Design a protein around this motif. Structure first.
Motif, PDB file in Angstrom:
ATOM      1  N   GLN A   1       0.825  -1.202   0.000  1.00  0.00           N
ATOM      2  CA  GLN A   1       0.000   0.000   0.000  1.00  0.00           C
ATOM      3  C   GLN A   1       0.863   1.257   0.000  1.00  0.00           C
ATOM      4  N   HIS A   2       0.237   2.401  -0.274  1.00  0.00           N
ATOM      5  CA  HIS A   2       0.922   3.693  -0.333  1.00  0.00           C
ATOM      6  C   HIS A   2       0.125   4.701   0.492  1.00  0.00           C
ATOM      7  N   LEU A   3       0.415   4.750   1.792  1.00  0.00           N
ATOM      8  CA  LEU A   3      -0.187   5.700   2.720  1.00  0.00           C
ATOM      9  C   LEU A   3       0.901   6.406   3.522  1.00  0.00           C
ATOM     10  N   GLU A   4       2.038   6.681   2.881  1.00  0.00           N
ATOM     11  CA  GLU A   4       3.251   7.082   3.590  1.00  0.00           C
ATOM     12  C   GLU A   4       3.344   8.604   3.655  1.00  0.00           C
ATOM     13  N   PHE A   5       2.686   9.170   4.669  1.00  0.00           N
ATOM     14  CA  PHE A   5       2.975  10.528   5.115  1.00  0.00           C
ATOM     15  C   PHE A   5       4.141  10.564   6.092  1.00  0.00           C
ATOM     16  N   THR A   6       4.611   9.393   6.533  1.00  0.00           N
ATOM     17  CA  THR A   6       5.782   9.333   7.399  1.00  0.00           C
ATOM     18  C   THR A   6       7.025   9.852   6.692  1.00  0.00           C
ATOM     19  N   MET A   7       7.095   9.704   5.372  1.00  0.00           N
ATOM     20  CA  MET A   7       8.216  10.242   4.609  1.00  0.00           C
ATOM     21  C   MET A   7       8.219  11.766   4.667  1.00  0.00           C
ATOM     22  N   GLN A   8       7.039  12.364   4.488  1.00  0.00           N
ATOM     23  CA  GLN A   8       6.924  13.814   4.602  1.00  0.00           C
ATOM     24  C   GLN A   8       7.248  14.279   6.016  1.00  0.00           C
ATOM     25  N   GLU A   9       6.812  13.519   7.023  1.00  0.00           N
ATOM     26  CA  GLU A   9       7.121  13.884   8.403  1.00  0.00           C
ATOM     27  C   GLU A   9       8.621  13.796   8.677  1.00  0.00           C
ATOM     28  N   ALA A  10       9.288  12.785   8.116  1.00  0.00           N
ATOM     29  CA  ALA A  10      10.732  12.663   8.281  1.00  0.00           C
ATOM     30  C   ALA A  10      11.468  13.782   7.555  1.00  0.00           C
ATOM     31  N   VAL A  11      10.956  14.205   6.398  1.00  0.00           N
ATOM     32  CA  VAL A  11      11.550  15.345   5.706  1.00  0.00           C
ATOM     33  C   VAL A  11      11.372  16.617   6.528  1.00  0.00           C
ATOM     34  N   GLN A  12      10.216  16.767   7.181  1.00  0.00           N
ATOM     35  CA  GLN A  12      10.016  17.896   8.087  1.00  0.00           C
ATOM     36  C   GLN A  12      11.017  17.863   9.237  1.00  0.00           C
ATOM     37  N   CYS A  13      11.225  16.683   9.826  1.00  0.00           N
ATOM     38  CA  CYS A  13      12.193  16.553  10.913  1.00  0.00           C
ATOM     39  C   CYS A  13      13.603  16.888  10.442  1.00  0.00           C
ATOM     40  N   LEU A  14      13.968  16.440   9.238  1.00  0.00           N
ATOM     41  CA  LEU A  14      15.287  16.749   8.696  1.00  0.00           C
ATOM     42  C   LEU A  14      15.434  18.236   8.398  1.00  0.00           C
ATOM     43  N   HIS A  15      14.342  18.899   8.010  1.00  0.00           N
ATOM     44  CA  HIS A  15      14.376  20.348   7.846  1.00  0.00           C
ATOM     45  C   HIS A  15      14.529  21.057   9.185  1.00  0.00           C
ATOM     46  N   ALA A  16      13.958  20.492  10.251  1.00  0.00           N
ATOM     47  CA  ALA A  16      13.986  21.160  11.549  1.00  0.00           C
ATOM     48  C   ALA A  16      15.401  21.240  12.112  1.00  0.00           C
ATOM     49  N   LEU A  17      16.172  20.160  12.000  1.00  0.00           N
ATOM     50  CA  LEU A  17      17.506  20.094  12.583  1.00  0.00           C
ATOM     51  C   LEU A  17      18.600  20.564  11.631  1.00  0.00           C
ATOM     52  N   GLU A  18      18.237  21.197  10.513  1.00  0.00           N
ATOM     53  CA  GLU A  18      19.243  21.605   9.536  1.00  0.00           C
ATOM     54  C   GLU A  18      20.173  22.669  10.109  1.00  0.00           C
ATOM     55  N   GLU A  19      19.643  23.562  10.940  1.00  0.00           N
ATOM     56  CA  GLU A  19      20.421  24.653  11.509  1.00  0.00           C
ATOM     57  C   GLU A  19      21.112  24.283  12.816  1.00  0.00           C
ATOM     58  N   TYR A  20      20.994  23.035  13.268  1.00  0.00           N
ATOM     59  CA  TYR A  20      21.584  22.617  14.532  1.00  0.00           C
ATOM     60  C   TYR A  20      22.666  21.557  14.380  1.00  0.00           C
ATOM     61  N   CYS A  21      22.988  21.141  13.159  1.00  0.00           N
ATOM     62  CA  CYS A  21      24.010  20.121  12.974  1.00  0.00           C
ATOM     63  C   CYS A  21      25.393  20.701  13.266  1.00  0.00           C
ATOM     64  N   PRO A  22      26.300  19.912  13.850  1.00  0.00           N
ATOM     65  CA  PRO A  22      27.639  20.440  14.153  1.00  0.00           C
ATOM     66  C   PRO A  22      28.510  20.636  12.926  1.00  0.00           C
ATOM     67  N   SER A  23      28.186  19.997  11.805  1.00  0.00           N
ATOM     68  CA  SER A  23      28.978  20.137  10.592  1.00  0.00           C
ATOM     69  C   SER A  23      28.105  19.791   9.395  1.00  0.00           C
ATOM     70  N   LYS A  24      28.488  20.328   8.235  1.00  0.00           N
ATOM     71  CA  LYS A  24      27.748  20.040   7.012  1.00  0.00           C
ATOM     72  C   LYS A  24      27.867  18.572   6.622  1.00  0.00           C
ATOM     73  N   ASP A  25      28.998  17.938   6.939  1.00  0.00           N
ATOM     74  CA  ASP A  25      29.153  16.515   6.654  1.00  0.00           C
ATOM     75  C   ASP A  25      28.197  15.678   7.494  1.00  0.00           C
ATOM     76  N   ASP A  26      27.948  16.092   8.739  1.00  0.00           N
ATOM     77  CA  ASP A  26      26.990  15.378   9.576  1.00  0.00           C
ATOM     78  C   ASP A  26      25.580  15.480   9.005  1.00  0.00           C
ATOM     79  N   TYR A  27      25.194  16.669   8.534  1.00  0.00           N
ATOM     80  CA  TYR A  27      23.881  16.821   7.918  1.00  0.00           C
ATOM     81  C   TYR A  27      23.785  16.054   6.606  1.00  0.00           C
ATOM     82  N   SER A  28      24.887  15.955   5.858  1.00  0.00           N
ATOM     83  CA  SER A  28      24.874  15.157   4.636  1.00  0.00           C
ATOM     84  C   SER A  28      24.734  13.673   4.952  1.00  0.00           C
TER      85      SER A  28
END
Lengths: 265, 270
Positions: free
Chosen positions: B99-126
């Protein structure tokens, strides 16, 4: 000499303690996480235990299906137990939410014909109307772990008089005796008391030693060393020719789990 | 005849310490929730923060520790970083469970957007972004034996070390010592050895026979002992006045991580 201890047996001790305190959720979690079972079961009995404690109710029905052909087996009670536990778990999964409702309805329809009375089926139907199955007075303390434990015990009592389960090795050496963890803790505290008494007299009391027991820390933070044993050996033999304890335990209580979700997935 | 008092709460504290020592955090959390016992001295705010972090209520944690973001002796980047990183890891975990009911992917993308400004290095965010293309978060080389409950415990430990400066609490006589249960079990075994020795010479033994006759699961003879040895040592004349132990570590099965990879889904449904 070197003493060897195995952590699986310490886990068996704490599992026996959890079972004694009826902490069945913690007991099941510990069994699943450590892979240790405080018990010795025959291969078929162990397989039935693993099936019941994992919510694989259809595999339970199929595994005990050959036992239903016999006369005085009472397959109605076994099917009732299994299907009622399955229906209660389906309803519990549904209360945490169209698919679970369908499964609960199918389980209720399946157990329709195995109920002891017609009022019991009406109770199980009224359980569907409630927003959570724990609202009923007869199900206020129902949780999947202790329910699976009690169901496995009941099915074991039922099928024990058909399939042999005593043809096994002696449980001594694979099980805790009775309150083995608590007794060992008490004996360790008394050992601490004896060592404290031997240290206090050699460095310049009767009841103060018994009242200076610290279960969590142990007062003086020391470790394990063979001193009292070696000290008793060097004593002269003319001392052993010369010559209970009220333990008040305090019970606990916790005012009141999504286990069947891990069984479906 | 004097009496001693034993709190089973403290025995459960010892059991919880033993469970934490071996990283058996699933059963540890289960025991805590089922017995209402927490091994440690925590304030009412510290206990609520522990409850939130262990139940995966990450947004609740962010709203709860928000009044502390203004203090000088409090780092805001590291705390938000670890909290949002656990949030993103649990979102990716619940995404890997579908099935395809995956809003969890969008939620995970939101979470990854949230912590973008808090990573200790760009390599860690990559690296954190490289976890989106993996079908399994724990199939990564740097996440071989990653566990949600263990990660929640470590995150709570880090946040506790951080916010310890504020709202603290009584002495540390509310938690058991390091491996206190093991020490007490070993001392009880040695007490059984000493009792069997005192019973041997006074009736019908070597230094090694008492050590070889030791038994953990069962007693020496299931002898329910009292203060017999203590009363014997108590009335002795005044003129009457090391060990290496090998512990076999546990080999817990692999079916524990596969099982615990569904606890973020439980937290999302609670």
């Amino acid at each position: 000499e070197t003493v060897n201890v195995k952590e699986v047996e310490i886990i068996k001790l704490i599992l026996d303690f959890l079972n004694s305190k009826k902490l069945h959720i913690s007991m099941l979690a510990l069994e699943k996480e450590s892979g240790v079972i405080n018990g010795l079961f025959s291969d078929d009995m162990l397989f039935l235990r693993q099936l019941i404690l994992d919510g694989q109710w259809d595999e339970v029905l199929q595994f005990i299906q050959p036992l239903e052909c016999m006369e005085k087996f009472d397959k109605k009670r076994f099917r009732y137990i299994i299907l009622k536990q399955k229906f209660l778990e389906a309803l519990c999964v549904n209360n945490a939410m169209e698919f679970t409702m369908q499964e609960a309805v199918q389980c209720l329809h399946a157990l329709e014909e195995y109920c002891p009375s017609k009022d019991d089926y009406s109770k199980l139907c009224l359980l569907l109307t409630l927003p959570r199955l724990t609202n009923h007075a007869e199900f206020k303390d129902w949780n999947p772990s202790t329910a699976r434990v009690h169901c496995f015990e009941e099915v074991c009592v039922m099928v024990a008089e058909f399939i042999p389960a005593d043809r096994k090795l002696s449980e001594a050496g694979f099980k805790a005796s009775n309150n083995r963890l608590f007794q060992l803790v008490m004996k360790g505290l008394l050992y601490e008391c004896c060592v404290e008494f031997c240290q206090s007299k050699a460095t310049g009391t009767e009841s103060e030693v018994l009242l200076g027991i610290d279960l969590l820390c142990g007062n003086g933070c020391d470790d394990l060393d063979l001193s009292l044993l070696s000290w008793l050996q060097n004593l002269p033999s003319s001392v052993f020719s010369c010559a209970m304890l009220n333990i008040h335990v305090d019970k606990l209580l916790k005012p009141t789990l999504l286990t069947p979700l891990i069984s479906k997935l």
